[PDB]
Design an enzyme around this catalytic site. Structure first.
Site, PDB file in Angstrom:
ATOM      1  N   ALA A  44       0.828  -1.195   0.000  1.00 34.35           N
ATOM      2  CA  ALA A  44       0.000   0.000   0.000  1.00 34.35           C
ATOM      3  C   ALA A  44       0.866   1.250   0.000  1.00 34.35           C
ATOM      4  O   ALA A  44       1.861   1.336   0.720  1.00 34.35           O
ATOM      5  CB  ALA A  44      -0.931  -0.004   1.211  1.00 34.35           C
TER       6      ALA A  44
ATOM      7  N   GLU B  93      -2.456   6.555   4.404  1.00 30.77           N
ATOM      8  CA  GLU B  93      -2.269   6.905   3.009  1.00 30.77           C
ATOM      9  C   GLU B  93      -2.880   8.264   2.726  1.00 30.77           C
ATOM     10  O   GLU B  93      -2.247   9.121   2.098  1.00 30.77           O
ATOM     11  CB  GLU B  93      -2.889   5.835   2.122  1.00 30.77           C
ATOM     12  CG  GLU B  93      -2.191   4.491   2.190  1.00 30.77           C
ATOM     13  CD  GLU B  93      -0.735   4.567   1.773  1.00 30.77           C
ATOM     14  OE1 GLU B  93      -0.380   5.503   1.032  1.00 30.77           O
ATOM     15  OE2 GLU B  93       0.052   3.685   2.169  1.00 30.77           O
TER      16      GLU B  93
ATOM     17  N   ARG C  14      23.484  -4.763  17.735  1.00 31.04           N
ATOM     18  CA  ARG C  14      22.228  -5.424  18.064  1.00 31.04           C
ATOM     19  C   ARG C  14      22.108  -5.586  19.571  1.00 31.04           C
ATOM     20  O   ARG C  14      21.015  -5.475  20.141  1.00 31.04           O
ATOM     21  CB  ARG C  14      22.147  -6.780  17.367  1.00 31.04           C
ATOM     22  CG  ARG C  14      22.017  -6.698  15.857  1.00 31.04           C
ATOM     23  CD  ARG C  14      20.576  -6.505  15.400  1.00 31.04           C
ATOM     24  NE  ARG C  14      19.935  -7.766  15.046  1.00 31.04           N
ATOM     25  CZ  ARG C  14      18.708  -7.877  14.557  1.00 31.04           C
ATOM     26  NH1 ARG C  14      17.879  -6.848  14.529  1.00 31.04           N
ATOM     27  NH2 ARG C  14      18.284  -9.061  14.131  1.00 31.04           N
TER      28      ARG C  14
ATOM     29  N   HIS D 137      16.142  -3.524   2.797  1.00 26.08           N
ATOM     30  CA  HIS D 137      16.607  -2.166   2.553  1.00 26.08           C
ATOM     31  C   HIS D 137      18.118  -2.054   2.493  1.00 26.08           C
ATOM     32  O   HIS D 137      18.630  -1.040   2.007  1.00 26.08           O
ATOM     33  CB  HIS D 137      16.056  -1.244   3.623  1.00 26.08           C
ATOM     34  CG  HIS D 137      14.580  -1.067   3.537  1.00 26.08           C
ATOM     35  ND1 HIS D 137      13.991  -0.164   2.681  1.00 26.08           N
ATOM     36  CD2 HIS D 137      13.569  -1.700   4.174  1.00 26.08           C
ATOM     37  CE1 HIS D 137      12.679  -0.231   2.809  1.00 26.08           C
ATOM     38  NE2 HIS D 137      12.397  -1.154   3.712  1.00 26.08           N
TER      39      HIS D 137
ATOM     40  N   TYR E 156      12.676   6.648   9.250  1.00 20.63           N
ATOM     41  CA  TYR E 156      11.614   6.064  10.048  1.00 20.63           C
ATOM     42  C   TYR E 156      11.777   6.456  11.496  1.00 20.63           C
ATOM     43  O   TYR E 156      10.800   6.778  12.182  1.00 20.63           O
ATOM     44  CB  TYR E 156      11.650   4.550   9.927  1.00 20.63           C
ATOM     45  CG  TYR E 156      11.082   3.989   8.656  1.00 20.63           C
ATOM     46  CD1 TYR E 156      11.874   3.828   7.537  1.00 20.63           C
ATOM     47  CD2 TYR E 156       9.754   3.613   8.578  1.00 20.63           C
ATOM     48  CE1 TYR E 156      11.363   3.312   6.374  1.00 20.63           C
ATOM     49  CE2 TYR E 156       9.231   3.099   7.416  1.00 20.63           C
ATOM     50  CZ  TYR E 156      10.044   2.941   6.321  1.00 20.63           C
ATOM     51  OH  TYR E 156       9.533   2.422   5.161  1.00 20.63           O
TER      52      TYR E 156
END
Ligand SMILES: *[C@@H]1O[C@H](CO[C@@H]2O[C@@H](C)[C@@H](O)[C@@H](O)[C@@H]2O)[C@@H](O[C@@H]2O[C@H](CO)[C@@H](O[C@@H]3O[C@H](CO[C@H]4O[C@H](CO)[C@@H](O)[C@H](O)[C@@H]4O)[C@@H](O)[C@H](O[C@H]4O[C@H](CO)[C@@H](O)[C@H](O)[C@@H]4O)[C@@H]3O)[C@H](O)[C@H]2NC(C)=O)[C@H](O)[C@H]1NC(C)=O
Ligand SMILES: *[C@@H]1O[C@H](CO)[C@@H](O[C@@H]2O[C@H](CO)[C@@H](O[C@@H]3O[C@H](CO[C@H]4O[C@H](CO)[C@@H](O)[C@H](O)[C@@H]4O)[C@@H](O)[C@H](O[C@H]4O[C@H](CO)[C@@H](O)[C@H](O)[C@@H]4O)[C@@H]3O)[C@H](O)[C@H]2NC(C)=O)[C@H](O)[C@H]1NC(C)=O
Ligand SMILES: *[C@@H]1O[C@H](CO)[C@@H](O[C@@H]2O[C@H](CO)[C@@H](O[C@@H]3O[C@H](CO[C@H]4O[C@H](CO)[C@@H](O)[C@H](O)[C@@H]4O)[C@@H](O)[C@H](O)[C@@H]3O)[C@H](O)[C@H]2NC(C)=O)[C@H](O)[C@H]1NC(C)=O
Ligand SMILES: *[C@@H]1O[C@H](CO)[C@@H](O[C@@H]2O[C@H](CO)[C@@H](O[C@@H]3O[C@H](CO)[C@@H](O)[C@H](O)[C@@H]3O)[C@H](O)[C@H]2NC(C)=O)[C@H](O)[C@H]1NC(C)=O
Ligand SMILES: *[C@@H]1O[C@H](CO)[C@@H](O[C@@H]2O[C@H](CO)[C@@H](O[C@@H]3O[C@H](CO)[C@@H](O)[C@H](O)[C@@H]3O)[C@H](O)[C@H]2NC(C)=O)[C@H](O)[C@H]1NC(C)=O
Ligand SMILES: *[C@@H]1O[C@H](CO)[C@@H](O[C@@H]2O[C@H](CO)[C@@H](O[C@@H]3O[C@H](CO)[C@@H](O)[C@H](O)[C@@H]3O)[C@H](O)[C@H]2NC(C)=O)[C@H](O)[C@H]1NC(C)=O
Ligand SMILES: *[C@@H]1O[C@H](CO)[C@@H](O[C@@H]2O[C@H](CO)[C@@H](O[C@@H]3O[C@H](CO)[C@@H](O)[C@H](O)[C@@H]3O)[C@H](O)[C@H]2NC(C)=O)[C@H](O)[C@H]1NC(C)=O
Ligand SMILES: *[C@@H]1O[C@H](CO)[C@@H](O[C@@H]2O[C@H](CO)[C@@H](O)[C@H](O)[C@H]2NC(C)=O)[C@H](O)[C@H]1NC(C)=O
Ligand SMILES: *[C@@H]1O[C@H](CO)[C@@H](O[C@@H]2O[C@H](CO)[C@@H](O)[C@H](O)[C@H]2NC(C)=O)[C@H](O)[C@H]1NC(C)=O
Ligand SMILES: *[C@@H]1O[C@H](CO)[C@@H](O)[C@H](O)[C@H]1NC(C)=O
Ligand SMILES: *[C@@H]1O[C@H](CO)[C@@H](O)[C@H](O)[C@H]1NC(C)=O
Ligand SMILES: *[C@@H]1O[C@H](CO)[C@@H](O)[C@H](O)[C@H]1NC(C)=O
Ligand SMILES: *[C@@H]1O[C@H](CO)[C@@H](O)[C@H](O)[C@H]1NC(C)=O
Ligand SMILES: [Cl-]
Ligand SMILES: [Zn+2]
Length: 1201
Positions: free
Chosen positions: A930, A960, A1065, A1089, A1099
């Site tokens: 989407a 959206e 991590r 990515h 993000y």
């Protein structure tokens, strides 16, 4: 030995001195005549043949001066000062001055040749680009023209320095030797040093003291003008190069020496609309010609009842560019042969208004000679060496007046417009007032040299100090004792004094005021003319008639009435510009003078490599227009196919898309290469500035074609590798990453199967990427460097337009640690009871394969195992939407309603016909991720979602729609800025308008849930569900781009890629791998990515700043109490609060929009901590109930086998 060349016998008496002088006069003019005759011949007939004659005649003159001087110095020097008549003393003193001739012949040659070399070097000086250029630039026309005409700081700087380099450096040693001999020679004449001799001409015991007092009186005028130009230059070049309080860069003043500011008049011109009255066009139609121009000039003097030109003049003068075509020194000059019977002007006249004035000037000299022609040759010179020019000037001023032009007939009406004369007077102000300090300091500097106050180690130190102290200028580059910039001005290496001009300039206006007062004239002095005033002519004649017999000061007192120079007449002449400028300065609040003098500009970004870069801004404006006009079509074309293919996977659409891909490639490179030719650092339109900086990034296209080809080849190989990797069971059953393996991770609770999936994907997909990563890094780093960045890490981080990003991000992350740590430990406890202590260490980090996600970037999949309170639903929202008849369009319609209540732009009508809200049924295959799409056509905006009627998709829909909303309200900006304030903003806005959707209030408001018990647990349940992604996703998103940054930094290498990953991590996610791993594996390849080379830090920014916005809206909407209970709905002001921010698009640094929204210019995590405050409390409390200890100090533990 010719008696006509050598003195005879004379007594030391005044009668002897008189007889000697009389004898000197007779022969002297004969000698001078011969000298000038050849001088005139060569100057009027340029050829080496005449040069030889000129050289010979000058040589003879020196021997004559030597013979007479020799006898004079020996005979009278012990008595000369006692002679009664100053007339005699003046004559004797001049001849008694032997100068250089005093030196012994060996030193004479050294001194004379040295002077010749100094002159040679200056004129020979050549400036060459740092390239094997076919031809270099000489002082003129090239260097002066380019410096006078160019306005590119980098270009202008290079020319300024090169000239000082070529001219200054080689002169420095030589000038010292001249200093020794020059002072040595005059020592024999009787002057302490060369400086004392030059100052001796003015017969003023306090001469230098006088000048400082003069200069201090003019400084008020100079400072006002200096401040005004400083402001104007700042308007053109910007604060980076013009410190409003400090000195002006010497090279920006329009001329190699900053001695004249005329060339910048175009920037400062007051009343730009009034045209400068040029009579040339009329003069031409009047049939005037050069020859008559002079007779017109003669009439002026006849109007002054002065002596008309002798017929010899019309015969001798070289009025024009000779028809013979032989070479001539066309530079206009006035010559006086000491032969009493003739005087000549050499004009090379061309019919222009400027030359008309010029001719009057020169003729004034002729008039001056004629008036003292009767005096003895030694006295047939100006009262003082500066006195000569002034007379010529004052004549020049009067005729320049339009009043005079009308009297001549070259003007029908004398329009008495103050705007016109102010414009005129300002031009003259830039031409000569700027000169005053310069002319004063150079000879101020030389006296320091000749006096020794400036020892050799200070030639440049004192030069810039003096040049800065008086003229208010500093160098364009830091210059040190290696330089000798004094050699950069013609008058220095040619050893010609400068003070004459400065004094001449004051005398000019001092005389002018007197004649005007004498002419009975009144009112504006700059409107005065002496034409037809015979009474004033007689006064002027008186001053000329005395020549050099009477001391200049004595004559001046008779003329104007004052025994000394004064600034008052000059100021009154410029009174009008003085008054006007102060108001201009007053309105701008300019700081008169230049405090903080120790300030100077930085070097150009790529100096001297960028010195030829184009800086003209008018074409850049047009460039941006064509760029938008063309880019709109190309991206729209790109978007059209890209959209068409994303919805219609048909293979031929891919072929079509690829061709369109080439077009954008063509376009990107075409306009990108052109963009790099503009130099952004010199621009001042902020919009254009950011636009070009962006387009200048060529990214991959900066790579050589071979390496770009190699780079794309590698990208696809990595992309392909990831695209086809799969994990297969021993039976050969092969599972794909999505949705298959994702379902395993999302649904399995079996330690064995989860590890197999996690381990398997990393084994086949992960390890393989090391087949390309190293060269990949090298290549993108090469590209980044070729784009002007330190490395690819710098390249990406630059998009946040804030150097302290990592520091800010670090602090922001630390502030979340208490929350994340509590959550981390709480999840650990949940895992503990399902997988057991054999696989869960309550005191260590969590096994990174149990977080329900292939990458453990999002933990929402384990919500069932972590829910704090069961019985969370009061109703099934999915069944309810179905029960209420919800449809995809109805879902998006509800969003539009929400957006409409918020006063934002409604969706365009075409949206409803071209968006794809449902899975197509016509057999087309769709790329189901989407997303929202903008076609840059101000009308086409579309959403593509495989919409399922459920709460999850309801959030997607609003999200959206958030993007769509963001597109619409910056549709008015050019495509080049049709982006968010920063990469985060675009993705961040998407969540803000969605956040409220899932709140119980909004959920219930739409009856998606029937009334529920008002428990906080339902609030807590919702908040955790939110946190289980919003929070967990933060650290993971941080680690990836940091890991890449330090790899782009080269600080991390393949030998430890895996260790740096897991170490991060651990430190950032508190995670460890489920099983040991050695080299040959490259776990980072496991996340799309990375091999897709897409940044992630956006993000992170999105998940932070979105909470600042939400708080701002809730504050603006007036909501108080638990922040999660806030509902933006229908808040007419909250929407407007965002609307104004969104319209900025990418035109501004995000701190501006951030403030405009929230009221703060920095990113702050506090809003988020406040948002989750209740959940923190519950989680923190739960930790106490279980006594769970936060952190992971015990780094090395893993689930038991
Ligand atoms: C530079 O300019 C000089 C000045 O010229 C005057 O100003 C310019 C702007 C024009 O208006 C021009 O017409 C003016 O004369 C210029 O000298 C002049 O040159 C022109 C020709 O180019 C000569 O024209 C002839 O003038 C005579 C009259 O002048 C004489 O007599 C009077 C007294 O009556 C004296 O005052 C003068 O000093 C002269 O002695 C005319 O009779 C003659 O007529 C001819 O042409 C007409 C048709 O137009 C026929 O009908 C006749 O039969 C003749 O054939 C010309 O008109 C002018 O004499 C002369 N003046 C002066 C003062 O020398 C000079 O040549 C220019 N130099 C350069 C290099 O350009
Ligand atoms: C510096 O040195 C120079 C050169 O020695 C002197 O120049 C001389 O100046 C005098 C005047 O001061 C000039 O005398 C003039 O002579 C004219 C006649 O010249 C012809 O005849 C002489 C012989 O008598 C020849 O030598 C010459 O070549 C010519 O063939 C006269 O017509 C002049 O008349 C003017 O003065 C008299 C008074 O003397 C008046 O009654 C007249 O009305 C008129 O005003 C004059 O007599 C001499 O010609 C100049 N010589 C040269 C070579 O040019 C400078 O004088 C001297 N400086 C000073 C301050 O004295
Ligand atoms: C998904 O995208 C595909 C590519 O755009 C679409 O494929 C097209 O589908 C139509 C039917 O829906 C096919 O129609 C056939 O076209 C051929 C050739 O037509 C060309 O020549 C005629 C003149 O003879 C001209 O009038 C046309 O405009 C074309 O230029 C005909 O011979 C057939 O009888 C039939 O009309 C297309 O062939 C086909 N094109 C391609 C490139 O595949 C597909 O429809 C899209 N799907 C959806 C749901 O939008
Ligand atoms: C100015 O007056 C001086 C004298 O006060 C003149 O100087 C003399 O010049 C002559 C030549 O012109 C020299 O003649 C030589 O004298 C020596 C003896 O001293 C003799 O042996 C030689 O045979 C020759 O005759 C003379 O020496 C010299 N005198 C001095 C003291 O230097 C000069 O000529 C006069 N100049 C003018 C323009 O009137
Ligand atoms: C400009 O300067 C040059 C050189 O100083 C001058 O050239 C010279 O002009 C003279 C005549 O004016 C020439 O002498 C004559 O030449 C003719 C033709 O050959 C001959 O018939 C004569 O008997 C006499 O020899 C001379 O050769 C020539 N060149 C040089 C090197 O002197 C020129 O005249 C000057 N022009 C002006 C306007 O001053
Ligand atoms: C003014 O500048 C010129 C050019 O630099 C100087 O002429 C040069 O003077 C030096 C000695 O003073 C000559 O040196 C000799 O050079 C040759 C090589 O060229 C070398 O083999 C010898 O051992 C010696 O070093 C040089 O030749 C000469 N050049 C020319 C073209 O004449 C002149 O001395 C300078 N004058 C002043 C006052 O600075
Ligand atoms: C005075 O300041 C000037 C500069 O304003 C100093 O001269 C500069 O010195 C540097 C090296 O110290 C030169 O750059 C170097 O050039 C060599 C090739 O010659 C290159 O291999 C290096 O990588 C570096 O680029 C520079 O060209 C030179 N500039 C000038 C105008 O001379 C000078 O050392 C200073 N002296 C004192 C006493 O402060
Ligand atoms: C900077 O340049 C831009 C680009 O030309 C200017 O934008 C123009 O703004 C006016 C109204 O202010 C519009 O009518 C034009 O259409 C705009 N240009 C284009 C190409 O659309 C902007 O005004 C300039 N601003 C400054 C401060 O210099
Ligand atoms: C290959 O073997 C594995 C292991 O037996 C099979 O995986 C099982 O698949 C069924 C559904 O098909 C699941 O209910 C089981 O939970 C799976 N077990 C494990 C351990 O994952 C797989 O289906 C086999 N594939 C083929 C083609 O035979
Ligand atoms: C004249 O000479 C004497 C003695 O050298 C000196 O005192 C006096 O100042 C001199 N006059 C001038 C005007 O120099
Ligand atoms: C122009 O007008 C001003 C008005 O203040 C006056 O002072 C000045 O004398 C006028 N000049 C002429 C030439 O008329
Ligand atoms: C666009 O790229 C293709 C690649 O082969 C090239 O042939 C074409 O000339 C390019 N056109 C422009 C305008 O750059
Ligand atoms: C949408 O398409 C229908 C035909 O399917 C048409 O009647 C309607 O006007 C269209 N609306 C817009 C906004 O294009
Ligand atoms: Cl980014
Ligand atoms: Zn002059």
């Amino acid at each position: 030995l010719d008696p006509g060349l050598q003195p005879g016998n004379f007594s030391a008496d005044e009668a002897g001195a008189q007889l000697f002088a009389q004898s000197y006069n007779s022969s002297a003019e004969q000698v001078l005549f011969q000298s000038v005759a050849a001088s005139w011949a060569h100057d009027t007939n340029i050829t080496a043949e005449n040069a030889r004659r000129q050289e010979e005649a000058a040589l003879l003159s020196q021997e004559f001066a030597e013979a007479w001087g020799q006898k004079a110095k020996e005979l009278y020097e012990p008595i000369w000062q006692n002679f009664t008549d100053p007339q005699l003393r003046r004559i004797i003193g001049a001849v008694r001055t032997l100068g250089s001739a005093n030196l012994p012949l060996a030193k004479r040659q050294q001194y004379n040749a040295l002077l010749s070399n100094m002159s040679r070097i200056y004129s020979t000086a050549k400036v060459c680009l740092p390239n094997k250029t076919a031809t270099c630039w000489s002082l003129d026309p090239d260097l002066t023209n380019i410096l006078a005409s160019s306005r590119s700081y980098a270009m202008l700087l290079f020319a300024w320095e090169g000239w000082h380099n070529a001219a200054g450096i080689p002169l420095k040693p030589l000038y010292e030797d001249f200093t020794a001999l020059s002072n040595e020679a005059y020592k024999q004449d009787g002057f302490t040093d060369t400086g004392a001799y030059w100052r001796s001409w003015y017969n003023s015991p306090t001469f230098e003291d006088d000048l400082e007092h003069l200069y201090q009186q003019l400084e008020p005028l100079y400072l006002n003008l200096h401040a005004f130009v400083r402001r104007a230059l700042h308007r053109r070049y910007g604060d980076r190069y013009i410190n409003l309080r400090g000195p002006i860069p010497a090279h920006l003043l329009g001329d190699m020496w900053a001695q004249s500011w005329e060339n910048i008049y175009d920037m400062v011109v007051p009343f730009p609309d009034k045209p400068n009255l040029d009579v040339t066009s009329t003069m031409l139609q009047q049939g005037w010609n050069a020859t008559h121009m002079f007779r017109v000039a003669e009439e002026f003097f006849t109007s002054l009842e002065l002596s008309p030109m002798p017929p010899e003049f019309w015969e001798g003068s070289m009025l024009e560019k000779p028809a013979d075509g032989r070479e001539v020194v066309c530079h206009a000059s006035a010559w006086d042969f000491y032969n009493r019977k003739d005087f000549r002007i050499k004009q090379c006249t061309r019919v222009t208004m400027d030359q008309l004035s010029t001719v009057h000037h020169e003729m004034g000299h002729i008039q001056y000679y004629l008036q003292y022609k009767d005096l003895p040759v030694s006295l047939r010179r100006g009262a003082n060496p500066g006195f000569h020019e002034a007379i010529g000037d004052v004549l020049a001023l009067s005729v320049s007046t339009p009043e005079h032009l009308h009297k001549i007939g070259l003007l029908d009406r004398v329009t008495n417009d103050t705007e016109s004369d102010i414009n005129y007077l300002l031009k003259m102000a830039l031409e000569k007032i700027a000169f005053l300090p310069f002319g004063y300091l150079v000879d101020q500097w030389r006296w320091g040299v000749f006096s020794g106050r400036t020892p050799p180690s200070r030639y440049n130190f004192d030069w810039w100090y003096l040049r800065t102290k008086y003229q208010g200028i500093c160098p364009p580059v830091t210059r040190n004792e290696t330089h000798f910039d004094a050699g950069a001005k013609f008058h220095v290496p040619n050893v010609t004094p400068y003070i004459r001009y400065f004094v001449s300039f004051v005398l000019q206006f001092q005389f002018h005021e007197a004649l005007c007062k004498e002419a009975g004239y009144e009112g504006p002095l700059h409107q005065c003319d002496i034409y037809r005033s015979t009474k004033a002519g007689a006064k002027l004649r008186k001053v000329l008639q005395a020549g050099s017999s009477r001391p200049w000061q004595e004559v001046l007192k008779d003329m104007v009435g004052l025994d000394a120079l004064d600034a008052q007449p000059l100021l009154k002449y410029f009174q009008l510009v003085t008054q006007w400028l102060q108001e201009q300065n007053q309105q701008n609040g300019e700081v008169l003078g230049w405090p903080e003098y120790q300030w100077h500009p930085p070097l150009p970004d790529n100096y001297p490599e960028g010195i030829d870069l184009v800086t003209d801004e008018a074409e850049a404006s047009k460039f941006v227009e064509e760029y938008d006009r063309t880019s709109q079509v190309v991206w729209n074309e790109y978007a059209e196919a890209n959209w068409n293919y994303n919805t219609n996977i048909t293979t031929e659409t891919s072929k079509i898309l690829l061709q369109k891909n080439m077009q954008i490639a063509n376009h990107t490179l075409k306009y990108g290469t052109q963009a790099r030719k503009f130099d952004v650092n010199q621009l001042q339109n902020t919009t254009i500035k950011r636009i070009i900086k962006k387009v200048q990034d060529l990214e991959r296209a900066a790579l050589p074609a071979q390496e770009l080809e190699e780079y794309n080849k590698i990208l696809l190989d990595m992309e392909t590798t990831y695209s086809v990797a799969t994990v297969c069971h021993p039976n050969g059953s092969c599972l794909q990453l999505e949705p298959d393996l994702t379902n395993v991770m999302a649904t399995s609770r079996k330690y064995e199967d989860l590890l197999w999936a996690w381990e398997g994907w990393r084994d086949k997909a992960g390890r393989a990427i090391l087949q390309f990563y190293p060269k990949y890094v090298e290549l993108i780093n090469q590209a980044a460097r070729l784009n002007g960045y330190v490395d690819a890490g710098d390249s990406w981080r630059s998009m946040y337009e804030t150097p302290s990003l990592e520091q800010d991000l670090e602090r922001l992350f630390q502030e979340l640690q208490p929350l994340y740590l509590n959550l981390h430990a709480y999840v650990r406890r949940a895992l503990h009871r399902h997988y057991g202590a054999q696989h869960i260490n309550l005191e260590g980090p969590i096994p990174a394969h149990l977080l329900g996600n292939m990458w453990a970037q999002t933990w929402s999949n384990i919500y069932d195992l972590v829910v704090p309170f069961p019985s969370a639903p009061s109703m099934d929202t999915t069944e309810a939407m179905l029960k209420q008849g919800w449809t995809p369009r109805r879902m998006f319609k509800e969003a539009d309603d929400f957006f409409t209540s918020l006063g934002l732009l409604p969706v365009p009508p075409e949206f409803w016909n071209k968006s794809m809200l449902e899975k197509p049924t016509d057999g087309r295959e769709v790329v189901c991720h989407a997303s929202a799409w903008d076609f840059y056509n101000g009308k086409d905006f579309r959403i593509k979602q495989c919409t399922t009627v459920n709460l999850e998709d309801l959030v997607v829909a609003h999200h959206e729609m958030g993007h769509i909303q963001y597109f619409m309200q910056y549709k008015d900006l050019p495509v080049a800025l049709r982006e968010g304030a920063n990469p985060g903003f675009h993705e961040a806005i998407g969540d803000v308008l969605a956040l409220s959707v899932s709140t119980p209030k909004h959920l219930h408001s739409l009856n998606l849930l029937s009334s529920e018990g008002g428990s906080d647990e339902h609030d807590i349940n919702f908040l955790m569900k939110m946190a289980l992604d919003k929070i967990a996703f933060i650290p993971f998103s941080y680690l990836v781009d940091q890991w890449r940054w330090r790899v782009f930094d080269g600080s991390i290498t393949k030998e430890n890629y895996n260790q740096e990953w897991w170490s991060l991590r651990l430190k950032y996610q508190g995670l460890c791998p489920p099983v040991p791993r050695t080299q040959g594996d490259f776990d980072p390849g496991a996340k799309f990515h990375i091999p897709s080379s897409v940044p992630y830090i956006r993000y992170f920014v999105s998940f932070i700043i979105q909470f600042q916005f939400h708080e701002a809206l809730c504050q603006a909407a007036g909501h108080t109490g638990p922040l999660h209970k806030c509902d933006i709905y229908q808040s007419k002001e909250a929407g407007q609060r965002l609307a104004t921010a969104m319209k900025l698009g990418f035109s501004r640094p995000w701190p501006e929009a951030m403030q405009l929204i929230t009221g703060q210019p920095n990113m702050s995590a506090s809003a988020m901590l406040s948002y989750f405050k209740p959940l923190l409390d519950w989680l923190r409390t739960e930790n106490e109930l279980h006594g769970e200890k936060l952190g992971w100090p015990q780094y090395n533990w893993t689930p038991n086998s």
